[PDB]
Design an enzyme around this catalytic site. Structure first.
Site, PDB file in Angstrom:
ATOM      1  N   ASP B  84       0.828  -1.206   0.000  1.00 47.96           N
ATOM      2  CA  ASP B  84       0.000   0.000   0.000  1.00 47.96           C
ATOM      3  C   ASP B  84       0.863   1.258   0.000  1.00 47.96           C
ATOM      4  OD1 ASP B  84      -2.986  -0.415  -0.107  1.00 47.96           O
ATOM      5  OD2 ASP B  84      -2.660  -1.720   1.584  1.00 47.96           O
ATOM      6  N   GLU B 115      -5.676   4.113  -1.205  1.00 48.42           N
ATOM      7  CA  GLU B 115      -4.553   3.309  -0.740  1.00 48.42           C
ATOM      8  C   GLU B 115      -3.841   4.021   0.439  1.00 48.42           C
ATOM      9  OE1 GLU B 115      -4.943   0.646  -1.945  1.00 48.42           O
ATOM     10  OE2 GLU B 115      -4.545   0.335  -4.055  1.00 48.42           O
ATOM     11  N   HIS B 118      -5.504   3.010   3.388  1.00 47.39           N
ATOM     12  CA  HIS B 118      -5.057   1.656   3.815  1.00 47.39           C
ATOM     13  C   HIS B 118      -3.737   1.794   4.595  1.00 47.39           C
ATOM     14  CE1 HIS B 118      -7.432  -0.204   0.224  1.00 47.39           C
ATOM     15  NE2 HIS B 118      -8.180   0.460   1.074  1.00 47.39           N
ATOM     16  N   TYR B 122      -2.776   0.677   8.629  1.00 54.07           N
ATOM     17  CA  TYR B 122      -1.690  -0.180   9.166  1.00 54.07           C
ATOM     18  C   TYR B 122      -0.949   0.540  10.288  1.00 54.07           C
ATOM     19  CZ  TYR B 122      -2.572  -2.453   4.677  1.00 54.07           C
ATOM     20  OH  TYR B 122      -3.146  -3.095   3.571  1.00 54.07           O
ATOM     21  N   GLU B 204      -3.102  -6.373  -7.227  1.00 57.94           N
ATOM     22  CA  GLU B 204      -4.258  -6.214  -6.356  1.00 57.94           C
ATOM     23  C   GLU B 204      -5.147  -7.442  -6.319  1.00 57.94           C
ATOM     24  OE1 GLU B 204      -5.442  -2.450  -7.937  1.00 57.94           O
ATOM     25  OE2 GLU B 204      -4.847  -1.544  -6.033  1.00 57.94           O
ATOM     26  N   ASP B 237     -12.381  -2.369  -0.765  1.00 55.72           N
ATOM     27  CA  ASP B 237     -11.778  -1.372  -1.677  1.00 55.72           C
ATOM     28  C   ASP B 237     -10.977  -2.069  -2.763  1.00 55.72           C
ATOM     29  OD1 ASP B 237     -12.708   0.792  -0.118  1.00 55.72           O
ATOM     30  OD2 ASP B 237     -10.802   0.960   0.959  1.00 55.72           O
ATOM     31  N   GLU B 238     -10.191  -3.080  -2.379  1.00 55.88           N
ATOM     32  CA  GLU B 238      -9.374  -3.755  -3.387  1.00 55.88           C
ATOM     33  C   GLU B 238     -10.214  -4.389  -4.480  1.00 55.88           C
ATOM     34  OE1 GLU B 238      -6.385  -3.227  -3.914  1.00 55.88           O
ATOM     35  OE2 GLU B 238      -6.253  -1.957  -2.075  1.00 55.88           O
ATOM     36  N   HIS B 241     -10.660  -1.825  -6.915  1.00 56.34           N
ATOM     37  CA  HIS B 241      -9.409  -1.529  -7.623  1.00 56.34           C
ATOM     38  C   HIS B 241      -9.140  -2.568  -8.706  1.00 56.34           C
ATOM     39  CE1 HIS B 241      -7.974   0.603  -3.671  1.00 56.34           C
ATOM     40  NE2 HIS B 241      -9.060   1.135  -4.205  1.00 56.34           N
TER      41      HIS B 241
END
Ligand SMILES: [Hg+2]
Ligand SMILES: [Hg+2]
Ligand SMILES: [Hg+2]
Ligand SMILES: [Hg+2]
Ligand SMILES: [Hg+2]
Ligand SMILES: [Hg+2]
Ligand SMILES: [Hg+2]
Ligand SMILES: [Hg+2]
Ligand SMILES: [Hg+2]
Ligand SMILES: [Hg+2]
Ligand SMILES: [Hg+2]
Ligand SMILES: [Hg+2]
Ligand SMILES: [Hg+2]
Ligand SMILES: [Mn+2]
Ligand SMILES: [Mn+2]
Ligand SMILES: [Mn+2]
Ligand SMILES: [Mn+2]
EC number: 1.17.4.1
Lengths: 341, 340
Positions: B84, B115, B118, B122, B204, B237-238, B241
């Site tokens: 990410d 991203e 994201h 983390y 992805e 979300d991915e 994408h």
């Protein structure tokens, strides 16, 4: 010489904002300059959706407007649309390749994203006020007076990008390309970045604010209220954006981030000053034209020239520049009702 | 020769997705391809703030895990963070300069922005489960096995950016730069873009999904539920994408956009296939490091390998490629609970 993931373990708290090692890991548990993390947080907290604002009464208000007021309104909206079209892509294409600390990299991507929301909101407005939006969108690119008012904005970004590409590909030195000498100087590239950031500061801190005065003058008459609600949300974001460039510029000029940048900033103080005055003059020239077929109600070219001078003095003082205009208090205090910042 | 506001009044419905006139006005009242406008709307509807997710019980859960399970959890999370970090900046530095339709330009900026959220999630997880986040973050850069698993991602984007700078600066032709002959071929640049997109699709659609399976294996044990809530939002979300890249790729292959891109997609089909095979092998190779200190019930090198083959076949079929692996049913059907 740019890389999307620099493989050298580096201390991101010790890199300069710009021209250092490209950012590798995106982390937000620490920062060199916490203002950028605070701005990211605030901008995320202000997330809004244009489609959610009711603009259903704006069509009838617009149609009832006198022709010269329709002209004022749409011309102003076209300029807002042009500025945010440029601002959605430019901070990313021009600044990301040069940023070396994570919080500034993510702030730029967050700032640019928020500008795309602004562009989406102008579509929402336009679609609800004219039968055919293409009439409006196709007049932005070659509109004579718009080109004039925004003249030079795309050039500062374009020149910075071109110079950055040459620096990343060839590095510092005297090169040849197809029989011509091409000189690449980090000092010159640092100057181009500084003047570009000063221009962005004038764009968000002066050009947009003059545009807000026009939009909110209609709101004061209880007209174009859907547009007003959207512009209110846009202005709340622009306050953050101007805050970010003011901090970037003040950190660069103080010498605390990059000593060379501080020497460069002092060296072009006169250039910087004249570019601010020129931006001010372009906004005045626009107001004079727009208010030619007739001054609007509660706003005219002289009140607007006064507002341009007032806000230009404030913004220039905020980044350490001398004041070009006679000091006065705000000529349109009613605007503070709408600037919830 | 790139410009932030092209001065020519052009019909944006007639430009190719890439390599046409840079976008001037950002408008959303019409689209050459409405799928990108739909993707922008869906991603915006999914907006989430990581910090709001409660991860207070994850610290208790994490410290309670046996050492090797801590290793599996943290090694996976460091890889997600690497990917990410790259995906937050790369679509904007590598793709934005080449886009010529507004709906795709804004989709790319929206996707890249998502991203960065994201990455922010983390940091929220890491700072709340360990005492010194720096040791985790610094290891991402220097970790040989992590870099080995990701090898080729940053390199592809970097080569594309370099070739793009030469094209914007010099234009097509054969040039002399500091006494060296430099060829700038738009066809070669289109191939680089095309293969970069195929590589992003693999990233992805496969690499992130193998990481989701690792994350969710802990959620199945009723642990690391804060992380699980976040990974669930990230996976949602991915999915958008990878929908975006599958559509870019399949539209280019159809011949309905730039015809030269349709020729390239056909001509470069073995390279597409090869990069998927290589990415699959890299994800498999990672298992030796992941399980170095021991595996877990239901999560080990064999299971990981089977899942890599399963998902790779699915994603390759979705963009028209032959299948490299023996067909099999899903080896970890419990993952569907988490992916929705
Ligand atoms: Hg700039
Ligand atoms: Hg600029
Ligand atoms: Hg105005
Ligand atoms: Hg006005
Ligand atoms: Hg300057
Ligand atoms: Hg200055
Ligand atoms: Hg300036
Ligand atoms: Hg003035
Ligand atoms: Hg790519
Ligand atoms: Hg790529
Ligand atoms: Hg896994
Ligand atoms: Hg292919
Ligand atoms: Hg296998
Ligand atoms: Mn804006
Ligand atoms: Mn702005
Ligand atoms: Mn992601
Ligand atoms: Mn993604």
């Amino acid at each position: 010489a740019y890389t999307t993931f620099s493989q050298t373990k580096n201390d991101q708290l010790k890199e300069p904002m710009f021209f250092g090692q490209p950012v590798n890991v995106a982390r937000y548990d620490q920062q060199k300059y916490d203002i950028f993390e605070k701005l990211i947080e605030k901008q995320l907290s202000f997330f809004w959706r244009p489609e959610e604002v009711d603009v259903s009464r704006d069509r009838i208000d617009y149609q009832a407007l006198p022709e010269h007021e329709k002209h004022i309104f749409i011309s102003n909206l076209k300029y807002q649309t042009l500025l945010d079209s440029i601002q959605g892509r430019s901070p990313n294409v021009a600044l990301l390749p040069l940023i070396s600390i994570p919080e500034l990299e993510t702030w730029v991507e967050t700032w640019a994203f928020s500008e795309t929301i602004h562009s989406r909101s102008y579509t929402h407005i336009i679609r609800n006020i004219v039968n055919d939006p293409s009439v409006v969108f196709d007049d932005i690119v070659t509109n004579e007076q718009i080109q004039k008012r925004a003249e030079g904005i795309s050039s500062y970004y374009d020149e910075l990008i071109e110079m950055t590409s040459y620096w990343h590909l060839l590095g510092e030195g005297t090169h040849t390309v197809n029989g011509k000498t091409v000189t690449v100087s980090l000092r010159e590239l640092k100057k181009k970045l500084y003047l570009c950031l000063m221009s962005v500061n004038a764009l968000e801190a002066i050009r947009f604010y003059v545009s807000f005065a026009c939009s909110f003058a209609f709101a004061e008459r209880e007209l174009m209220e859907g547009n007003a609600k959207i512009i209110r949300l846009i202005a709340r974001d622009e306050a953050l954006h101007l805050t970010g460039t003011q901090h970037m510029l003040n950190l660069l000029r103080s010498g605390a981030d990059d000593p060379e940048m501080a020497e460069i900033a002092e060296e072009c103080k006169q250039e910087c000053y004249d570019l601010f005055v020129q931006a001010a003059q372009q906004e005045k020239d626009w107001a004079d034209y727009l208010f030619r077929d007739g001054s609007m109600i509660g706003l005219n070219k002289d009140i607007l020239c006064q507002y341009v001078e007032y806000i230009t003095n404030i913004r220039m003082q905020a980044v350490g520049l001398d004041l070009p205009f006679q000091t006065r208090s705000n000529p349109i205090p009613w605007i503070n009702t709408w600037l919830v910042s």
